[PDB]
């Protein structure tokens, strides 16, 4: 029961960095397509 | 000590293995101790984790030997066993888990569908249908054709053949492990002929000549020679001759469902043509399939589906319209959605490995 | 009780995606940084090929490139004055006169119509008896 | 040197929108105070992505091919997917083998 | 470039201590040395330029319009495309471009479907 | 089988054919639930019916059908109303898992209604049938007397009262077990409720029940009262302390309270001890000098320096940038740090003839590093030096006032009022560089010396010098005004300090009022939020940096998910170079106490795109990881040592050595690679200045303070937070127009350090000790399981790992009162015969009266 909030703290963490590890490919993605025009 | 309790449950697992007809003498005169080692809630204390050591096959293979009334040989007449067995591996999946733990979640549903499927309704069968669905990464080669096996019969019955053709089709995909070169596969794919044959027909028989005894290659050229040619006194016989088979699947039924096939495709063969048609020609072709009733059976024609015609019955003419032209009706739109879908579902899971 | 085993799923979960996404991320972020160091690269005035006429043991060179005249250049230490010899081809930059890489030795009789040919075709039944 | 300082449908529809609501409101105003063409060709002409609609007989036609051409690419995807499969299929193999 | 000599007494005050520098300024008391590239403008500037760079939100709707015409042969260039592509794949047997290449198409398609 | 046989009879519609069918529907509902879900609505209808008989039966079904669908609140509504048939005291896996969503329900109605009024708990006003289970469930647990299961679940349904209730009845004084499970549900408060209303309560009356208890114990009682930071609390703890009097007990109490707690905290504890007249030794121990001299006294015996090293350094380099006379003066202070010995720059003059303005300010703030710990010894020293007299510039006047700031930073009620009147002086001259450069070090010492009270009229001062527009002192000025109200801010000083951002031309001055808009908001959680808002609402680049610094020091401490949430959001989406580097090391401060996820985090971010946030990664690691050795931090920091990027390289190695810090060849295997390199970097010319900068300074981080400190931020002897130095490492970790500012380390040096204190002589014996970690996997460096006996001896170097397996001696001449107890941090001894010393030194403050 006292487990359960410590393993929540962990969970929590994890759930941001996966949603802003998904962010960040999108701004690459943009920055490959302006990269090809400057080029 | 804990080393010594997973070492108890090998042993008993291990045992119920080998007292059954693989690896030991008759699996009927065996049962009674293959039973009393299930029972006493020794299963349960199988739980150090899932099921997935015995298998769902196994289970089905000692309480169908119990219990079918022809195995049995009617040794009692109540499912009082079966009753027991499927509250019991209901009681399994309540604490089963989906996520991760599906390997004892998928082969219950499929112990509990069975028991359905061999005696009980159509009706209850819906909700079942919706637990079933679960990865199909967890279960084996052999377990995955099984389970589409099983939920390919279930969706017939419905009338979605369709969904069924997918499942089948899958199921019986390569072989690396056993029961898809056995007689499994020969179960399979007397399942698989009559799906077909129930969307339209199967004209194919290339696979099977190879993968089937010669006994069940005759009445699959049979039907498919009935339903081709349209005759309805060929498709009749080919249920009679082969009523042994028929009887010995347990649907019967689908003699019934099929015979009504047959008739729509005699009347469909000769096409609408031309933009009047004439009334002894259709006659003719209607006499073939009931000779009494040819005013009556284009009519059914028409509102079924079979065909599309517009009647005058103070003339006696048929007028239609003949088409072979296919202009849009949403289909560029179709694929383009259906693409979208295609690449997502299959890309997710090839990314995954 | 039943909520704790809950919790240890999710987690078990979510760590697949990230090894997912992960493995995806880097290979998009590669490339952004491959075509950095190509952009840097596509600014340049080009080398000049020379030829080495000889090599001074004080670190010079003495070399005659085909762009321009004849320079007296630094040699490089990228490169050892026993991988230069008289004649060969360098190339070196225009942008600090170093001798970056060897090509070939060159040769000018054998294009003012002296020819080798290898392995002859001829054999003594060609024009036999 | 411009370039050096700064280093779809919907928008112009709402503007569209606007105008005529604008418009309309002008109208009205028009009238109260007092006491062609050109409208005319902005009604009629529009009233059969409308416009788009007559035209959509010759779309659908190239619009089967153009996404013929899409599922092709999909394949593609497909076929470069196996690869990376492989690829991680032959790490594990080898971890295995040592 | 921007470029300005140096003045003793504030190059040496401000930016072992930096000996060459210090030599350099007890020397010469003048040598180039380069001034940072930078820009700064008001944001009013910023957001009026992006709407010019009227004659683009109007400017793409005829370019729309005037590509649905001209789609008879870009239609064409991309078939002729993909059937260097797939020959491409089976000699190797390249990869990248056929990737790069499915991209393009891709994008090329969500485009001509906007379009009408 | 089939169950339309049983629902036939259901539709006959009389009173005896609804209770069979009810009763034998109880029995193999769950297998044929299918067939029954149709009657469902006959069911729910007799539920709220009685035209039949059946109703808490029919619910009862009713639950039991809604379960085998998969809708477990819906079930929920009817096993309560079923009421009488259904008893949490049976159990089968049905009735475990629909009190678990019968809790989740429970949880999810209390969530709502402690946010809506915080008395909601005082009565039942949420649904009664949820409330009696939640009672009972309570009880279960507890009559079976595990009480970690019970408090859990009390926790997460938000009511106070039950908290309690639970706790107090099962208070039976054993001892031993009443003590260890409120040090549990303390720990579980802090970590992982950060619903800081609730979190409070919890904290105030756990105090209130461990004090009331004849036996208590002291240490965790004092990191209560440090959390809520209350001087009320402590004059009822002290109180508590007069009825069972003992002066070493008393004496360890105050040698805790002085360190962690902030200055205008320690100003009332004076105030209340004098009025109370309860121990003169303890005001003189609330007044800081005895903790500092005791630690002088170590680092002078303990000290290792090697001047060789710093001779060796500079040599390995060639000046051409003075960026290297800065790596060498600061990472001679470091070193040298405490041991009150100067020898370096003491020994070579001739460079310093050379330095320009600002690294010969440098030069003279070194001393300032040294020379704190003496806060009586520390005016004495620098008084040759001053503004009026000897020096040989003004920038050398100038740096004493900002050596002077360093140390006399904690106790600066002197300081400040001293230093103000040089503030009013110099605000005329501005005409000369000498004058501002002795204007700038006053700024900051001001600033240093009034932190953690908040004094107005510092405030007010410092403002003069921006209306003056002086370019450098104006820098100084503004980061100073954030440091003096840290965490106690006007919200008219915040509303005043945002409008002048905006209004400043100076590069200089906007740079250092977005710094000092950060500081202001210290602690003050969901409070900054509007801030935080307003600086990401100015469109100046110098603004956005400087709202990610105050998420970093306002959620500080115990992590936070929204805080960190609005942090890798600004570091995703925002483009600014200042901005995402910024951000990311804004994730290491709110990190501080949850340092192992640190890596995961920024795992990704190490190797992505554009080198500054490749940069705020290694700070990120070296703030939030210091002092600790974790193995995942140093794996993450290794490739960007060897970075291409020189600023990368730079502050990789900075980060390296915070972690390590007296962590040796041997214990860690790698430390010997790392501080070859260190040292291969100054020697080699390829480098550039900043990586050789880097390096420098990363060899002073290990051999800081003569090998004998760690940097962290926190005590070990509270086990509770160190305000001083966090807010040092901020301003440590900037440095891009911030050229002199790393003097800021010293306020981050705590010394690793077990040592006895003789109650009545003040002493440290130098006894052997007992030890079992293993000694020779310990090292003396440059110029693993255990359980094995082994032996150390006080006054030698105590290292984290060894801290742990240590023992005082019980049977010399001494009791130690209250014993050792796991962690750094001193113990006060009462002695049996103080009359012969055993083997005693003098202490620096009996070598100064």
Known sequence: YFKLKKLEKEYELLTLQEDYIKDEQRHLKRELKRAQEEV | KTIEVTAEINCFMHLLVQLFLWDSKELEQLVEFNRKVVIPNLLCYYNLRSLNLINAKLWFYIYLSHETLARSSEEINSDNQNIILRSTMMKFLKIASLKHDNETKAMLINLILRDFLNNGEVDSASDFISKLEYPHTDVSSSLEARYFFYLSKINAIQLDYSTANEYIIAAIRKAPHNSKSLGFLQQSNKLHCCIQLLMGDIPELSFFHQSNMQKSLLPYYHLTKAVKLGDLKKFTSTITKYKQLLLKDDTYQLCVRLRSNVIKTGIRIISLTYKKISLRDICLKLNLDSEQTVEYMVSRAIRDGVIEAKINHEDGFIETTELLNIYDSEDPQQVFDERIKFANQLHDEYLVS | ?129 | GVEHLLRIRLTNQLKSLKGLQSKLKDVVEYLDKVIHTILGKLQDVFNLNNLQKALTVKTNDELMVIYISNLVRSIIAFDDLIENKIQNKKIQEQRVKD | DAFRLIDTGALINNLLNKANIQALIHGLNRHYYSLNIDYHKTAKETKMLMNLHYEEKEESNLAATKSMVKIAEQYSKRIEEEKELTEEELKTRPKKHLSETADETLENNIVSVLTA | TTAAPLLALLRENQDSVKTYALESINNVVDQLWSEISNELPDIEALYDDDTFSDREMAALIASKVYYNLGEYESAVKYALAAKDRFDIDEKSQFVETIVSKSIEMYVQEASKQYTKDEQFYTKDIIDPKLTSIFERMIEKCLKASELKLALGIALEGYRLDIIESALKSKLDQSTSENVKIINYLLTLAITTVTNSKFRSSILRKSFDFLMNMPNCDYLTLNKVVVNLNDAGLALQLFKKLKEENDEGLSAQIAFDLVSSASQQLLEILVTELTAQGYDPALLNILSGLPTCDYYNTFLLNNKNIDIGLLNKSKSSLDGKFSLFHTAVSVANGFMHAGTTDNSFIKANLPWLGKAQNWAKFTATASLGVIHKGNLLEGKKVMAPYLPGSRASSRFIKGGSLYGLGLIYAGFGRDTTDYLKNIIVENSGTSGDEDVDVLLHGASLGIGLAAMGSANIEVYEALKEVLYNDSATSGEAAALGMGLCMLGTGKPEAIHDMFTYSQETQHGNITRGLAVGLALINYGRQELADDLITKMLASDESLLRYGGAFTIALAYAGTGNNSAVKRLLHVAVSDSNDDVRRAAVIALGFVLLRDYTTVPRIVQLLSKSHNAHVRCGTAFALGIACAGKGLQSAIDVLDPLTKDPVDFVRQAAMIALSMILIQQTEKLNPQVADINKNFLSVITNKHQEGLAKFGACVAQGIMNAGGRNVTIQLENADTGTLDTKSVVGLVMFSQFWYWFPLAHFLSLSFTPTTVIGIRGSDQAIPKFQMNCYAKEDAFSYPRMKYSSKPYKVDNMTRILPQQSRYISFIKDDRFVPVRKFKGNNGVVVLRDREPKEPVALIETVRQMKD
């Open chain 3, 1 to 129: 009780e039943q909520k704790i085993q809950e919790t240890e799923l999710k987690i078990r979960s979510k760590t697949e995606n990230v090894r997912r996404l992960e493995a995806q991320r880097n290979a998009l972020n590669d490339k952004v940084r491959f075509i950095k160091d190509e952009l840097r690269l596509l600014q340049e005035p080009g080398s000049y090929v020379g030829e080495v006429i000889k090599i001074v043991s004080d670190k010079k060179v003495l070399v005659k490139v085909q762009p321009e005249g004849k320079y007296i250049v630094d040699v490089a230490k990228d490169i050892n004055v026993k991988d230069l010899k008289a004649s060969q081809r360098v190339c070196l930059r225009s942008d600090s006169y170093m001798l970056h890489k060897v090509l070939e030795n060159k040769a000018d009789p054998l294009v003012s119509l002296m020819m080798v040919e290898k392995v002859p075709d001829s054999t003594y039944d060609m024009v036999g008896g």
